[PDB]
Amino acid sequence: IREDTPPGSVIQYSDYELDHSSPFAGGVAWIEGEFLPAEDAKISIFDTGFGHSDLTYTVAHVWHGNIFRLGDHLDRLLDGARKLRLDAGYTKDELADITKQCVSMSQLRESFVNLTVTRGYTHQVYIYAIPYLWAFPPAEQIFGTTAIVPRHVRRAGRNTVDPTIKNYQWGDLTAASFEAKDRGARTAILLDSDNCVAEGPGFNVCIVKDGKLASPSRNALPGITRKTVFEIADQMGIEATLRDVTSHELYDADELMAVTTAGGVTPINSLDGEAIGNGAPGPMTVAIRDRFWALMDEPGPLIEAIEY
């Protein structure tokens, strides 16, 4: 339900206890129209979401009992489903109610919330709310992580397995993560076929150079964390641009950061074993990350309180 986070840092879990009398406590899944405890959640092996990975999905997070940008996530999920000729069979409002009920039943104040739409065996909608998941550990959110550029892997292009529609087809992402681990790095930043920056295994990459922020426009998910970071940057008076970022620019960056729903804004201290800047989290990354976590507690349109 919780994990250690750096003391006095912007990231702190809620202080509360689960009611274990409820079978729903700690995880809830909605499958084939029925809410279920997460542990028993199961899907037909014959769903083409398995055999063909014929699906799209989104993930939203809950922090301090508030779900973040659920409407944007549902818009993205439904837009991608339409591009894949998938019919969820539920309206955006209906999905929102079900999702929020999954969180409420789990009792989780911090949660990783998944909505998946699959072609099915009749299209299927699967939803779950489970304890908070970290793409990078809390310590790395605060003190930074390490990356490599794969020698042997590139990101799949938009004309193959399209990264702009969120998907479970991680063959290149998994291969890149193994290469990073083999090389002693925490993660990988993948290039596309033209040696432009694409994205990482589970995150977008933002590049800071000369006081400006850039992020890839082509072979990358249009991330909601990235959208949030760009809004924060705009409010700070920083110019933030979605554009092609060349491999030259990646290696020459003043700061690098990974951004994703599961854990937020992660500084990247080094690339290919070479320090980025001073080898510690950059000033713009720190400013944006701290503002991002403040949004989770501030009343506004980006967050909605779950009713437990």
Ligand SMILES: Cc1ncc(COP(=O)(O)O)c(C=O)c1O
């Ligand atoms: C491949 C990939 N790119 C980018 C992201 C970040 O997207 P978002 O900020 O909407 O979670 C994710 C989410 O983990 C992802 O899986």
